[PDB]
Ligand code: HEM
């Protein structure tokens with residue numbers, strides 16, 4: 398009849414005074430102790446429903462996809478995206494952009510590389526770069542971003558950028574800084590009080606700026622493509638979209654607009670780069686802390702692939718330990734602890750509550766990934782979380798780091814291919830070292846908000 402229960406709010410402040418200063422997720426986890434898996438928190442001016450645990454999350458997104466499939470705003474980036482592009486769209490725009498993006502992130506031109514071949518080539522460029530690093534220390538972020546960006550770059554722009562390209566790296570810096578700022582304490586506070594805080598200086602302005610700087614490139618690239626576009630031979634995702642645009646041009650309301658083109662593209666890049674990159678960063682920090690796991694992966698690589706032949710997607714089936722380690726990396730690293738906000742699209746009953754149209758809903762994917770019934774000792778990194786007693790791969794319906802239902806990560810397929818190929822191709826050719834002994838490696842995230850972001854760290858890649 399009413400909203401889910403939760404702490405009693407104040408006017409203006411919502412439940413500010415009941416929050417935990419360590420952040421939104423920690424706040425919410427404390428509410429769950431008291432209220433259970435379904436509860437309401439007033440984030441500044443508004444109510445927001447939190448759903449926790451895999452059962453409630455799956456009930457909402459899968460059993461009730463007709464109601465829970467809308468997209469809410471992320472206050473730090475809404476003034477940039479404004480409902481354009483597939484991540485932040487709703488209604489028919491979302492339908493159109495989703496169908497477009499899924500198709501063009503899957504099917505490429507006449508005789509163009511598969512996703513797998515694109516990742517395999519990128520991985521060879523990476524291991525050549527690592528060989529040329531001569532075991533030097535580095536923070537591998539730029540490379541992890543490079544390789545993931547370059548996959549999307551091959552689909553969207555028909556090209557890759559060289560790791561030495563300073564303009565490429567500049568754009569990668571902006572993706573890195575932006576995700577951090579968004580995930581910062583200010584960005585979490587901004588989610589509560591954007592109506593107030595937006596009038597002052599702050600990191601919201603820096604994020605807007607960063608995003609515009611990236612978007613400027615995309616605009617320009619769109620202009621260049623429009624200038625050389627061959628309708629008989631589209632080169633890439635941009636041409637394909639330009640084609641649709643030309644086809645629907647007599648419709649003033651076509652969703653194939655220039656703003657959707659720029660911001661959809663930016664969306665794909667942001668989500669395509671920074672997610673997988675961050676996962677690899679955590680992944681290798683975890684390998685430094687648990688060298689026995691990496692040695693064990695290497696054994697499996699040796700025994701299944703050998704030292705020479707490039708890993709291929711077919712290899713997954715035979716490498717349960719390695720797939721387990723990647724599952725566990727993704728589980729532990731908990732990229733988007735609160736997922737991406739949704740919003741009910743119609744009045745919905747949910748577990749005897751009534752959640753009205755337009756209410757924001759956070760699916761707290763972190764609660765599924767740390768569910769102690771599915772994962773013994775969920776706070777620890779342990780690949781056996783994903784193996785049975787025989788050492789066979791043990792998948793579980795709790796593993797929902799890409800979410801579920803209509804808005805499920807559209808890049809799931811690509812990200813899993815990337816994680817598998819990049820991870821195994823690196824481990825096949827290199828072992829890792831660093832100046833920090835494993836016992837001293839601190840896994841505490843540098844930021845934990847919309848994104849969980851690992852600390853910076855130095856690493857060496859030692860040729861085998
Ligand atoms: C480790 C990698 C990744 C993780 C953990 C991840 C996670 C997620 C999550 C949790 C969502 C929100 C789903 C929801 O709204 O309930 C999402 C959406 C999205 N992901 Fe990913 N993702 C990853 C990689 C990628 C990649 C590589 C791409 C592009 C190739 C991508 C493109 C997107 C897009 C476009 C959406 C918006 C989908 C929609 O609103 O319809 N993701 N992702």
Ligand SMILES: OC[C@H]1O[C@H](O[C@H]2[C@H](O)[C@@H](O)[C@H](OCCCCCC3CCCCC3)O[C@@H]2CO)[C@H](O)[C@@H](O)[C@@H]1O
Pocket residue numbers: 546550558564565568611613614615617666
């Ligand atoms: O379009 C307006 C802007 O154009 C210029 O900057 C260029 C830079 O001079 C030029 O060096 C830069 O190159 C970027 C190349 C690599 C981009 C790759 C990434 C872009 C999108 C996400 C994936 C990867 O692109 C910028 C934007 O087109 C001018 O320098 C700017 O002052 C101006 O604001």
Ligand SMILES: CC1(C)[C@@H]2CC[C@@]1(C)[C@H](Br)C2
Pocket residue numbers: 471474484576579667668671733737847848
């Ligand atoms: C996927 C994302 C681009 C990443 C996590 C949620 C996001 C929508 C915001 Br813009 C940062």
